Subunit: 493 residues, 4 copies
């Protein structure tokens, strides 16, 4: 509910390396475009391989035995994370406003959702810093055996544009809690907010080199991180397509540890006994949240025969009702899509939907004639074999599906190489308990959707990812287990 | 459906101490009665304080730093518990016959349920023996910190008669897996099967004095254990009143650790939307299982008012057809109560129910003319103020209660000093999820009853207990935690 | 290093109940005496049983199903704890000054040690609030099984006078992190600091009733808590003597869960290969810390033959060197003892030491003639059979012991009903590894002493206590495990 | 000292698929050679991609939702793994004889070490099967949240020849305990013992297609598994170079999860204050154990300069007396290398060491004239730049290095792309504690070597691996975590 800053000052537009604001070696820059107007907000440094090298070198120095970062109490890593949270909260209006400027998401979402979870993810992992225990192990023989939960080391972190601050949090927070150093490559489309955050990292007191931020393109900077021979781990969030190239690059370089957080085509499933009104609203936001550009979006809405006409009819009405407009307006629900390419990609899929024989129920075209706005779009009578049913559209397009039986809707929902998330809406206990086992997805929701918090481990089955972020389970990926085994004069229980 | 052994060889009738069969210092015996016939089976050693002191010395010595049992690999404690389970399997028919002889439960229970769980509990904890890890802890300062999950030491174990072999296993399996030594005091009513198990403990290869079994009366042998200045821990399963005393003896003697597993007045709650046929059957067996002598018996049946009369009629029907008879007949559903005293107590409670204004619906008197059999009894119209509603009857009496609202039946189910168990029957997701929170009991079942296995932590809220047994959580009471904190020259993460 | 407030305003001197400052029902008060001058600082409310009843009633209302405290996110319990930390830090000079006024400990200790650990313990458990997970359990049959880690409920907490704020932290922080409500009875000798803290609890935003503070006497208020029929748990820190009465009272009342943190006579053990200078200094502070009034104080210093004369000689010199005086002076190392009784108790033990044939090497008498100061006192040639060797003196008296062999010093160190802590000083690996297994104490230190932090579980073997505080292990005592078990239509791995 | 079986019956020479013995689709075989004699033993089926596809279909079907293996109690997966261990015990002499026949290791190794660990690993993981718990998570909002520790699914398992039975067990035991299905590709050099184990898997009672064993070449059969679009996970133990490829095949195919257990150049480090006799013996056996063909072989021996010459002379002495000969002679300490190719490779490295300027001290050529035997070889004067210092020789060659300072030898021990293991020999507490932190390897030993058991997480830093095997930590790679988040009507703590 506070009011935003409509023309924020953007002091930070350079590379953040070893706590110093820095131009690319090449001195090159590249523009970021405000998607609500189509106009150039400003220019940021265009980092390439040579800048990744400087960043990796600094993060390596910060990770070396006896560095300040390695020697500080685990609890001091906690306090630093906690202070960062406090700084984010202090500058919450600014940060959420900058997010809306650069990303285009509504300011209500940006302030009340994104920034809130950013603050929480930093606070949450602040708490884990000194509670991530190893084991003492009653092994055979005259031994004292235990494990250390050491950091894995220099982590390369690559994130997308859909939730810039949140995706940065998800990566930085657990990596820092566990004592790693970071070289992070943020999306080309949304470089600004992450840079203001790096100023807060400096203000918070993190040693130089522990966090380094690189703005630039994916195939240049990013491939440089994935391919780098002195990066111990890459944590990648992005398209399934690019995921394939990251795991390859790891095998091609130095066998760096890999976590992948990838695409999805997540099914919401409404049984006939569900609270209709609630299921229609949840499935509606399941897809339309963040202008359809959420990775775990409910992008296939499956609906039982007995209730499909009513469900369809109310869903259409909700799409038509959703406020589209300037995201700085408090009641805007859908901002523009992120850029020209994403915008045309989505209109292309709308066109494709119709060519394939899917029934267009509303929208289906540009909204207005400035920026990259698209009318909320719903498709009826979609079938499993259609391109719009199999591929990640990543936009405000809701395809509806009809089903009769439980066995059928399980098979159809799981018949995909994706497996990021899934949801069921039902009043019945046994049905809900069965769906939680049957659906092949990293997160299964019951009578809700998109409830991903700092506490909840999150990741794909199959080609939606490899490994888990958030919660206690999110720490494993940032941990290199060492087993210490010591000969003792006598063992006793 | 295997065949029982009737009137079999019973060599073990003495105290098991430091792996040698011994009578009490005073040379006394006491009789044990077959509840089916009413006839004395044999006499058994009558342990008192001087015998307990003997057993405590044996336990203390087997637990001394450097002993075989302390120095042994944790995995070998595993292999021993597993050998024990193999031996119980080999002699399964003999033990199931012996329990039925001495306690009175049907051979179909004794063989298929009791003995199966006994094997499973030695087997389950055999596996925990070498997996119960301490922690490495990234504390402040220039320190390596870790914890050892050491055994507490000499553990006094006092069990009841209702599941003589199961209760012995619930005690011995976790205690030995964590490497303690045991002085066990078996119930006076059911001494025989626990002594035969002791012969297998010896055959398995447990060092002398690790397990020490004592037969005797509670006020002498039990109280010597609870009051002993060299018992490190008491684990007690029995009556709430005796539990009060056990806790007082620990405070009056040596501040030994105390786990208490006490009585219940556990409610089964049947909502309007439940599967009627299933709910009737489940709540019938919740009470009458093991002749109403189960600690977690569903000894109050609360039923929603719209389905009350239907549930009532079906419940009386099912009580009228329960097969009462000789427990060696493979199809007897109900054996005799365990001794004269228990039999008369339950008859007293039937009478009491009638004088309080509760409607007797069936049974309500002795069955037959030899042994200690009671007809399955059901009461209707029961109120919360009645003594049969408040007190643990511990026999074949099923009181039925009527409720209208959710909020009313939670208050009434929880309005008791007890909290061992509870159960709900419903098809509704939301209602099930609310009751699992709202009911104050250590185990809440949904659409089932009495499902307590080696994996499931079991114990009481309020005066139904202190601590938990079974599962990983059952290991905590048998652990003394030692923190070890060592100056190191330089700490790195 | 900041300067203290020498005459702090003491606005809070009443009972804290349901967020309201409150006189005892009786309107009675009792004085607290400044131990450095012998003069009455002021009067606080004298709570008795009737005031405990009002406190318990309020904490019960705050714990009821659907209360604000029970419904708030676990993470909001974290934030509240974290804000409390922030408030303690804000008012750190005041609080540490008030502690020195009422307790008499040096302001350097009070500020740099006590207050620091108070801030950390609140911050540490703030982090645990939303990370204390239960289990999902792959049990036998067609079941979904999991455990809830519910709060145990209304916790009675009774603490001593030696570290008023710290002992309050150790109790409040984990109890609140896990969602319990509290009725706390603080020591009669040191009521003031805990009351200022309760104002911070209110300022932080904790719901009314969640924390209640009672000032008053042990046998009146305190026994009332231990004996209370609606208190679910008592956590007691105090004398072993009173511990016995708490566990009794629990058995005598409602079987409330009991944790006991009791006395000690902890041995430090210096082997011949230890860094002499360092061992002399560590063993010196091991006892003399907090004027000898630390519970885990190294109150028996065992020293190897080859090095005893040198060790003795340097230890004596350190005792004589230790600055005694006004605790508000920055370089004071030893303040006065807490009150007249403790003061004479210690001088009594000094007298007793000499009567028993122990060799007085320095001090042995009052220091000056105002307040309750005692000269640092060391005894040579102490033997295991002397009263000064067996009993908790709780003052600035260091007895030295000589030993030859490792087996011997193990037996002598463990030959006591106490077992709170222990320490060894040695350069040798195998020796250190052996001592960590052999010594029967809840904390074993290697080449240091008194390193107890929020991370490190802490408690007695034998009659030094029952259960553990601090670290992850500190949460178990404040947890009531509930096992939920649900019948499902089909189980799959 | 039990007696081996020479030239025994070997019925199993084909593929094990869906519990039926089958040849390859192409009907081809390949030979296996006895490294002792040099003579062909028998021929074995040559699996290729079409055979793998067959095996993947069998694994996929046994893993389908609702199958016997999915629906089975976790505890029964336990009991099956345990039956398997009983059967391996029954046929222990036959298997130990068969491993010695096919691989060449001494029967004293094969019987007493290898087979013992195999039994222990099936036994250890049998116990984990029903104890691998997920979590209940007190997340934000009106939600019950929990995790399921589901199996990842079809697991491709590729093992080497150096410990044919041990490596098979390290793979199958954890994977089956967590309820996966397996397609295993056994080494071409050592196919026989793994097929006999398959006969016991069938006798134990594992459902069809749960375990599927394939004999064949790496580039065909191995690569079909790593590249298959329906294998969910690859676990690979072998060479670093092949590990690179495995990681690339996963990225190029279906983003299957990858665990890699790769090569080493693990250093043993002997400080001046170490037990000389013990250190010589330990570092000698660290290298020559299993004929120098142990992944974690102590293949660099760094020795403090003050004790260098003494250590050198004693080490050559111990190399000169190692009993080289027929591995059925019970007292042979060293069998032959495994095949022609390995034999020539190691001879090449001996020669290479001489041309680089390293002093040959003993052996350094073929032993005898039949089979593939090499004399124990030691080099002195070795430098870090030499190829024998950098490359994994994987045979009976012990390079000796000289160091002065602590800081120097950590840098040099860590200066490698490898990090499987390391070890220190010292009596000093502080020095041991520093090395356990400072060395970059997944296992650090202190005053021992090669102590890897079922309890101890094992794996590489850097290019020695990704992830860990053995212990509780080894279960994580075989787990797909599912978060389940359910709307509830009211949340209470
Ligand atoms: N293990 C630990 O964590 C730890 C820490 C600090 C102090 N201590 C111990 O505390 C003791 C010193 O403090 P203390 O003298 O105040 O001990 P204490 O036993 O006299 O009193 C402790 C607290 O309990 C109260 N109390 C006294 N009698 C009571 C009764 N009958 N019922 C209920 N409460 C009663 C007191 O008022 C006080 O608040 C020493 O033995 C010391 O070793 C232990
Ligand atoms: C608030 O402090 C305590 C409360 C109870 C028990 C022990 C301590 C304690 C004593 N100590 C001390 C105090 C003084 C010394 C010391 C030793 C040698 C020379 C000077 C001071 C060491 C530890 C600590 N702590 C706790 C926090 C960790 C840091 N240190
Ligand atoms: Na932009
Ligand atoms: Na005072």
């Amino acid at each position: 509910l506070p009011s935003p800053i409509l023309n924020p000052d953007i002091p930070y537009n350079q590379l953040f390396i070893n706590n110093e604001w820095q131009d690319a070696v090449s001195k090159k820059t590249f523009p970021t475009v405000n998607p609500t107007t189509g106009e150039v907000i400003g220019h940021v440094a265009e980092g390439d391989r040579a800048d990744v090298d400087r960043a990796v070198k600094a993060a390596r120095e910060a990770f070396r035995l006896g560095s300040p970062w390695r020697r500080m109490d685990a609890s001091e890593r906690g306090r630093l994370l906690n202070r960062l949270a406090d700084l984010v909260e202090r500058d919450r209006v600014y940060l959420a406003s900058l997010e809306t400027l650069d990303n285009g998401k509504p300011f209500q979402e940006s302030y009340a959702l994104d920034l809130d979870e950013v603050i929480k993810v930093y606070r949450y992992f602040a708490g884990w810093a000194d509670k991530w225990h190893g084991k003492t192990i009653p092994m055979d023989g005259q031994h004292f055996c235990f494990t250390r939960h050491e950091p894995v080391g220099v982590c390369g972190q690559i994130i997308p544009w859909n939730f810039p601050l949140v995706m940065q949090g998800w990566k930085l927070a657990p990596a820092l809690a566990t004592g790693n150093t970071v070289v992070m490559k943020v999306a080309e489309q949304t470089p600004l907010s992450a840079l203001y955050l790096a100023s807060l990292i400096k203000e918070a007191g993190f040693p130089p080199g522990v966090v380094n931020i690189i703005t630039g393109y994916g195939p240049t900077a990013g491939a440089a991180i994935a391919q780098h021979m002195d990066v111990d781990k890459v944590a990648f969030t992005g398209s399934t397509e690019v995921g394939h190239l990251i795991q390859k690059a790891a095998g091609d370089s130095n066998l760096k540890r890999v976590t992948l957080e990838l695409g999805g085509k997540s099914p919401s499933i409404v049984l006939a006994d569900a609270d209709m009104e609630h299921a229609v609203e949840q499935c509606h936001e399941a897809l339309f949240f963040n202008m359809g550009q959420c990775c775990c979006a409910g992008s296939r809405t499956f609906v039982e025969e007995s209730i499909y006409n009513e469900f369809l009819e109310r869903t259409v009405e909700k799409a038509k009702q959703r406020k589209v407009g300037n995201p700085f307006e408090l009641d805007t629900q859908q901002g523009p899509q992120v850029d020209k390419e994403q915008f045309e990609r989505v209109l292309g899929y709308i066109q494709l939907g119709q060519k394939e024989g899917a029934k267009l129920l509303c929208g289906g075209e540009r909204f207005g004639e400035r920026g990259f706005f698209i009318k909320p779009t719903v498709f009826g009578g979609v079938q499993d074999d259609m391109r719009i049913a199999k591929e990640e559209i990543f936009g405000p397009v809701q395809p509806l599906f009809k089903f009769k039986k439980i066995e059928e809707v399980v098979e159809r929902a799981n018949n995909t190489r994706y497996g990021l998330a899934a949801a069921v809406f039902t009043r019945d206990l046994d049905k809900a308990m069965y769906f939680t086992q049957a659906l092949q997805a990293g997160t299964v929701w019951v009578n809700t959707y998109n409830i991903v918090t700092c506490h909840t481990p999150f990741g794909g089955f199959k080609e939606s990812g490899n490994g888990r972020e958030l919660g206690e389970d999110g720490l494993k990926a940032y941990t290199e287990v060492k087993t210490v085994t010591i000969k003792v004069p006598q063992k006793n229980s």
